[PDB]
Amino acid sequence: FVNEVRRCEEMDRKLRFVEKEIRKANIPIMDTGENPEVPFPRDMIDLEANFEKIENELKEINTNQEALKRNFLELTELKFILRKT
Amino acid sequence: ALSDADVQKQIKHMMAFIEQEANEKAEEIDAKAEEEFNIEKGRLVQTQRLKIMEYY
Amino acid sequence: GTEHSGSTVPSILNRMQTNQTPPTYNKTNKFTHGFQNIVDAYGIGTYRE
Amino acid sequence: NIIAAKAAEVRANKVNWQSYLQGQMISAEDCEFIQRFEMKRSSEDKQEMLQTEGSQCAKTFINLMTHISKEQTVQYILTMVDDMLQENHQRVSIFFDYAKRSKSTAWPYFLPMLNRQDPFTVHMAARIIAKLAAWGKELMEGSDLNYYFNWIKTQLSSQYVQCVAGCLQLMLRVNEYRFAWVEADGVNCIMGVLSNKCGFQLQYQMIFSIWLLAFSPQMCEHLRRYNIIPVLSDILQESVKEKVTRIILAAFRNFLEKSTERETRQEYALAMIQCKVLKQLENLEQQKYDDEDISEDIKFLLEKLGESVQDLSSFDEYSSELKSGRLEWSPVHKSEKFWRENAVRLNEKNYELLKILTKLLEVSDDPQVLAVAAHDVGEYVRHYPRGKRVIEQLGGKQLVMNHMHHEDQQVRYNALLAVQKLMVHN
């Protein structure tokens, strides 16, 4: 059953990535309580697959906005050099 | 009683479960034999129909 | 648990006694847990001691 | 276990037949048969039953179930005779109780019977029905067991219902009456009662019935009009009883094997679009069982679904639907092979398809097709700088900007993604 356990390890890795991403961006957590809120389905597998897809989406936005910032810096350099008689 | 009554319940559910699974395997294998009956009967019937229509 | 999932399970919990040594437990509370921990930090003894 | 309980109760009762061995009150010549060769465990007894030749067995027992009427005695007598009729793997086998003198000995006594449906009447009736499928007699007429209440009452209720369903799934083995029933409204009753959320054993038997009915390709073409395959896939998603998943998979495999005609087997594509079965096989493949048939059926379904997506994935029908004006979320959007290799085909004569997709983005206001077009255009420009400079010239960049302000926020995000695909060195 280590296939499921390895899947769980991947789930933990994705959630840890989300945790670091929110901590850098200063996004708090509610963390109210209600500890016994615990089902045991098989749909959680698909749920966390969807969450992994959303995490891949956020990763793509990161890896793209870095390039957008680089491009904007180059284009602002062009704007700067365009000030000269 | 509670001990031997539980033993009886375990034996009952065990024999019920295996009866289910094993009978169901038997039914499926019989159904496979039936589909293969169709296969053989088709093959032999057509191979005979060739000669039948030749003669007629 | 059987009522939630009706998988035709009588849920039988029998009992047995063997040579294996049982574990040891002592229920604590708000003003006795640290003391159980003090005893445990230096060692835990036999069963029903 | 109510009917099982009745069988257990009457399995401890041997009737008082010697007190009236020759008696006309009860079983004048039947009790003679009860006396003679009672030990069915002995093969000599079973094979010397042929001395009777059915003269007493199943010929004087005819209307004996109606001779007695007291609820506390008819039941014991009827259960004794039926229990003697039950096992018969070699006792009767292929209806050895012929008794050619009368055809009233087989079919036409049910009419006074099946009344007061509760005390082993409909049950022994279903047993006499079970003497038809793989036995030496066939049903004289279909309406005898296709237009009566012994199943209409069990449509909804109740161990008797389960027993009737079991006998019913057993009786769908010979095409002669399978076709007669199913071509009538039996299909509608089966669909109605499977769709009703009930005990898993019932639906489990009905998917056996579906698997047995799938044996005829013509019948699969007949039943294509019902949404059986995606709904069974939904049941597979929402119910995992091991055997139940095995039988749903077996039904899909049987359908895939029959293949009456490809042009009518759009169910290849329905098995994906309605429900992504490969998503379930991402985890069922992780599940391992001892039955090699599970693995073989899983591999068969996996390969065939893959080739179904292969055939369903075509630039031809893709451009046809792009010109038709109606768009959907086709799987080819995520097929990176398409956007990697066949993406230059979106450049028709002078970028005709790109032009008419730009026009579709201009005019249409349906969010689904607009998002589909925006996503496709983004994935097109993801691979072509020539297309990038063309779309920059066209001003469609501003059109996607206007889609970034669309009333639906998901389409706004899709347009944002499309513009981000228009952002490479820009």
Tab-separated table of N, CA, C and O in Angstrom, chain D residues 69-123:
chain	number	residue	atom	x	y	z
D	69	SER	N	-54.979	-26.104	1.255
D	69	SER	CA	-55.168	-24.657	1.337
D	69	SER	C	-54.941	-24.061	2.719
D	69	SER	O	-54.731	-22.847	2.804
D	70	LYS	N	-54.979	-24.847	3.792
D	70	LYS	CA	-54.709	-24.340	5.133
D	70	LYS	C	-53.288	-23.791	5.176
D	70	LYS	O	-52.362	-24.443	4.698
D	71	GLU	N	-53.106	-22.597	5.743
D	71	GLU	CA	-51.806	-21.938	5.636
D	71	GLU	C	-50.714	-22.711	6.371
D	71	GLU	O	-49.539	-22.647	5.994
D	72	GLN	N	-51.078	-23.442	7.426
D	72	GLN	CA	-50.087	-24.137	8.239
D	72	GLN	C	-49.757	-25.539	7.737
D	72	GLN	O	-48.824	-26.155	8.263
D	73	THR	N	-50.484	-26.057	6.748
D	73	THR	CA	-50.240	-27.388	6.195
D	73	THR	C	-49.817	-27.362	4.735
D	73	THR	O	-48.861	-28.056	4.363
D	74	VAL	N	-50.548	-26.625	3.892
D	74	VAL	CA	-50.131	-26.399	2.510
D	74	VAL	C	-48.685	-25.934	2.453
D	74	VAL	O	-47.941	-26.319	1.551
D	75	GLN	N	-48.257	-25.110	3.409
D	75	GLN	CA	-46.899	-24.586	3.344
D	75	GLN	C	-45.877	-25.688	3.572
D	75	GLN	O	-44.898	-25.792	2.827
D	76	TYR	N	-46.093	-26.532	4.581
D	76	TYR	CA	-45.164	-27.629	4.830
D	76	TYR	C	-45.149	-28.608	3.660
D	76	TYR	O	-44.080	-29.033	3.206
D	77	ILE	N	-46.329	-28.954	3.139
D	77	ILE	CA	-46.406	-29.888	2.016
D	77	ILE	C	-45.708	-29.305	0.792
D	77	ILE	O	-44.909	-29.977	0.121
D	78	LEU	N	-46.005	-28.042	0.488
D	78	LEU	CA	-45.463	-27.396	-0.695
D	78	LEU	C	-43.957	-27.235	-0.581
D	78	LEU	O	-43.233	-27.416	-1.563
D	79	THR	N	-43.464	-26.890	0.608
D	79	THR	CA	-42.029	-26.748	0.780
D	79	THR	C	-41.329	-28.094	0.728
D	79	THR	O	-40.209	-28.174	0.227
D	80	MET	N	-41.967	-29.165	1.204
D	80	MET	CA	-41.362	-30.485	1.062
D	80	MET	C	-41.227	-30.866	-0.408
D	80	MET	O	-40.143	-31.257	-0.864
D	81	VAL	N	-42.316	-30.746	-1.173
D	81	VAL	CA	-42.251	-31.128	-2.585
D	81	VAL	C	-41.285	-30.218	-3.338
D	81	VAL	O	-40.481	-30.683	-4.157
D	82	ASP	N	-41.326	-28.913	-3.061
D	82	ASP	CA	-40.415	-27.995	-3.730
D	82	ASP	C	-38.966	-28.277	-3.363
D	82	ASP	O	-38.111	-28.286	-4.245
D	83	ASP	N	-38.676	-28.522	-2.081
D	83	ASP	CA	-37.318	-28.836	-1.654
D	83	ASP	C	-36.818	-30.104	-2.321
D	83	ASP	O	-35.629	-30.218	-2.641
D	84	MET	N	-37.703	-31.079	-2.521
D	84	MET	CA	-37.319	-32.234	-3.316
D	84	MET	C	-37.059	-31.839	-4.764
D	84	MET	O	-36.195	-32.433	-5.414
D	85	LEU	N	-37.775	-30.843	-5.274
D	85	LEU	CA	-37.538	-30.332	-6.619
D	85	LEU	C	-36.349	-29.375	-6.725
D	85	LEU	O	-35.980	-29.011	-7.845
D	86	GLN	N	-35.736	-28.963	-5.610
D	86	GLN	CA	-34.800	-27.839	-5.650
D	86	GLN	C	-33.438	-28.215	-6.224
D	86	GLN	O	-33.024	-27.682	-7.259
D	87	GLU	N	-32.708	-29.101	-5.548
D	87	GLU	CA	-31.309	-29.309	-5.901
D	87	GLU	C	-31.204	-29.888	-7.307
D	87	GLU	O	-30.764	-29.192	-8.229
D	88	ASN	N	-31.641	-31.139	-7.472
D	88	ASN	CA	-31.813	-31.795	-8.767
D	88	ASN	C	-30.710	-31.495	-9.776
D	88	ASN	O	-30.993	-31.171	-10.934
D	89	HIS	N	-29.449	-31.590	-9.355
D	89	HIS	CA	-28.359	-31.433	-10.311
D	89	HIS	C	-28.266	-32.650	-11.221
D	89	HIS	O	-27.986	-32.521	-12.419
D	90	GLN	N	-28.496	-33.841	-10.664
D	90	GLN	CA	-28.584	-35.075	-11.428
D	90	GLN	C	-29.894	-35.819	-11.219
D	90	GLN	O	-30.158	-36.782	-11.947
D	91	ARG	N	-30.719	-35.406	-10.255
D	91	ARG	CA	-31.998	-36.077	-10.041
D	91	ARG	C	-32.924	-35.858	-11.227
D	91	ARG	O	-33.488	-36.810	-11.779
D	92	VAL	N	-33.091	-34.596	-11.630
D	92	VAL	CA	-33.901	-34.232	-12.781
D	92	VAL	C	-33.047	-33.660	-13.904
D	92	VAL	O	-33.201	-34.050	-15.067
D	93	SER	N	-32.122	-32.757	-13.577
D	93	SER	CA	-31.215	-32.163	-14.552
D	93	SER	C	-31.981	-31.535	-15.713
D	93	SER	O	-32.543	-30.448	-15.555
D	94	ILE	N	-32.008	-32.178	-16.878
D	94	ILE	CA	-32.692	-31.609	-18.053
D	94	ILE	C	-34.107	-32.178	-18.039
D	94	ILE	O	-34.483	-33.036	-18.841
D	95	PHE	N	-34.928	-31.634	-17.133
D	95	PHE	CA	-36.347	-31.960	-16.965
D	95	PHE	C	-36.666	-33.435	-17.199
D	95	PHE	O	-37.498	-33.763	-18.051
D	96	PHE	N	-36.002	-34.332	-16.465
D	96	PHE	CA	-36.241	-35.761	-16.650
D	96	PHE	C	-37.678	-36.140	-16.315
D	96	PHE	O	-38.151	-37.199	-16.743
D	97	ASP	N	-38.376	-35.312	-15.536
D	97	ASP	CA	-39.782	-35.554	-15.200
D	97	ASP	C	-40.667	-35.060	-16.348
D	97	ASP	O	-41.378	-34.056	-16.267
D	98	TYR	N	-40.629	-35.816	-17.448
D	98	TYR	CA	-41.389	-35.430	-18.632
D	98	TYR	C	-42.866	-35.756	-18.460
D	98	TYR	O	-43.715	-34.856	-18.447
D	99	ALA	N	-43.191	-37.038	-18.301
D	99	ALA	CA	-44.575	-37.489	-18.158
D	99	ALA	C	-45.427	-36.973	-19.321
D	99	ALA	O	-46.326	-36.147	-19.167
D	100	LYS	N	-45.100	-37.496	-20.504
D	100	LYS	CA	-45.623	-37.007	-21.778
D	100	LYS	C	-47.147	-37.028	-21.881
D	100	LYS	O	-47.708	-36.431	-22.806
D	101	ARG	N	-47.825	-37.717	-20.958
D	101	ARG	CA	-49.278	-37.844	-21.031
D	101	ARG	C	-49.981	-36.491	-21.013
D	101	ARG	O	-51.106	-36.376	-21.512
D	102	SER	N	-49.351	-35.462	-20.448
D	102	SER	CA	-50.012	-34.175	-20.289
D	102	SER	C	-48.983	-33.054	-20.291
D	102	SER	O	-47.935	-33.161	-19.650
D	103	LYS	N	-49.293	-31.979	-21.023
D	103	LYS	CA	-48.507	-30.753	-20.964
D	103	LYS	C	-48.967	-29.815	-19.859
D	103	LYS	O	-48.318	-28.788	-19.630
D	104	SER	N	-50.065	-30.138	-19.172
D	104	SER	CA	-50.457	-29.396	-17.982
D	104	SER	C	-49.489	-29.595	-16.826
D	104	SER	O	-49.592	-28.878	-15.825
D	105	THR	N	-48.560	-30.543	-16.938
D	105	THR	CA	-47.597	-30.809	-15.882
D	105	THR	C	-46.462	-29.797	-15.822
D	105	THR	O	-45.723	-29.800	-14.832
D	106	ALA	N	-46.305	-28.930	-16.827
D	106	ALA	CA	-45.193	-27.990	-16.830
D	106	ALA	C	-45.589	-26.527	-16.709
D	106	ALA	O	-45.229	-25.895	-15.715
D	107	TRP	N	-46.287	-25.963	-17.693
D	107	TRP	CA	-46.556	-24.527	-17.693
D	107	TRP	C	-47.894	-24.087	-17.099
D	107	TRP	O	-47.913	-23.204	-16.233
D	108	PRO	N	-49.042	-24.649	-17.541
D	108	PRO	CA	-50.320	-23.970	-17.284
D	108	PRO	C	-51.020	-24.367	-15.988
D	108	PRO	O	-52.150	-24.866	-16.015
D	109	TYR	N	-50.358	-24.159	-14.849
D	109	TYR	CA	-51.023	-24.168	-13.552
D	109	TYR	C	-50.768	-22.894	-12.764
D	109	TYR	O	-51.361	-22.720	-11.693
D	110	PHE	N	-49.899	-22.009	-13.255
D	110	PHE	CA	-49.569	-20.777	-12.549
D	110	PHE	C	-50.769	-19.844	-12.404
D	110	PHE	O	-50.763	-18.969	-11.530
D	111	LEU	N	-51.782	-19.982	-13.264
D	111	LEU	CA	-52.871	-19.005	-13.291
D	111	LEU	C	-53.667	-18.947	-11.995
D	111	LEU	O	-53.808	-17.846	-11.435
D	112	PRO	N	-54.207	-20.047	-11.462
D	112	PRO	CA	-54.826	-19.960	-10.128
D	112	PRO	C	-53.825	-19.571	-9.055
D	112	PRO	O	-54.214	-19.070	-7.993
D	113	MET	N	-52.542	-19.791	-9.320
D	113	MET	CA	-51.463	-19.602	-8.362
D	113	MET	C	-51.002	-18.144	-8.406
D	113	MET	O	-51.637	-17.284	-9.022
D	114	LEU	N	-49.888	-17.844	-7.736
D	114	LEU	CA	-49.310	-16.511	-7.585
D	114	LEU	C	-50.226	-15.562	-6.818
D	114	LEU	O	-49.952	-14.356	-6.784
D	115	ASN	N	-51.291	-16.062	-6.196
D	115	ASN	CA	-52.183	-15.245	-5.387
D	115	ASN	C	-51.781	-15.348	-3.921
D	115	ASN	O	-51.172	-16.333	-3.493
D	116	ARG	N	-52.127	-14.318	-3.152
D	116	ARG	CA	-51.693	-14.202	-1.763
D	116	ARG	C	-50.164	-14.230	-1.695
D	116	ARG	O	-49.557	-15.121	-1.103
D	117	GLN	N	-49.549	-13.234	-2.328
D	117	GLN	CA	-48.101	-13.228	-2.530
D	117	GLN	C	-47.398	-12.978	-1.204
D	117	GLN	O	-47.248	-11.833	-0.770
D	118	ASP	N	-46.938	-14.057	-0.566
D	118	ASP	CA	-46.150	-13.985	0.662
D	118	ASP	C	-45.657	-15.372	1.072
D	118	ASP	O	-44.443	-15.575	1.192
D	119	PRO	N	-46.549	-16.357	1.300
D	119	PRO	CA	-46.094	-17.615	1.918
D	119	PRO	C	-45.637	-18.653	0.895
D	119	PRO	O	-46.368	-19.577	0.521
D	120	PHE	N	-44.411	-18.494	0.400
D	120	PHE	CA	-43.735	-19.448	-0.477
D	120	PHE	C	-44.511	-19.730	-1.760
D	120	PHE	O	-44.299	-20.783	-2.366
D	121	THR	N	-45.407	-18.838	-2.190
D	121	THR	CA	-46.143	-19.061	-3.432
D	121	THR	C	-45.391	-18.476	-4.621
D	121	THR	O	-45.037	-19.193	-5.565
D	122	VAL	N	-45.126	-17.166	-4.586
D	122	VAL	CA	-44.304	-16.549	-5.625
D	122	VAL	C	-42.909	-17.153	-5.630
D	122	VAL	O	-42.234	-17.177	-6.664
D	123	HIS	N	-42.467	-17.688	-4.493
D	123	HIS	CA	-41.114	-18.220	-4.400
D	123	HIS	C	-41.006	-19.563	-5.114
D	123	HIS	O	-40.093	-19.781	-5.922
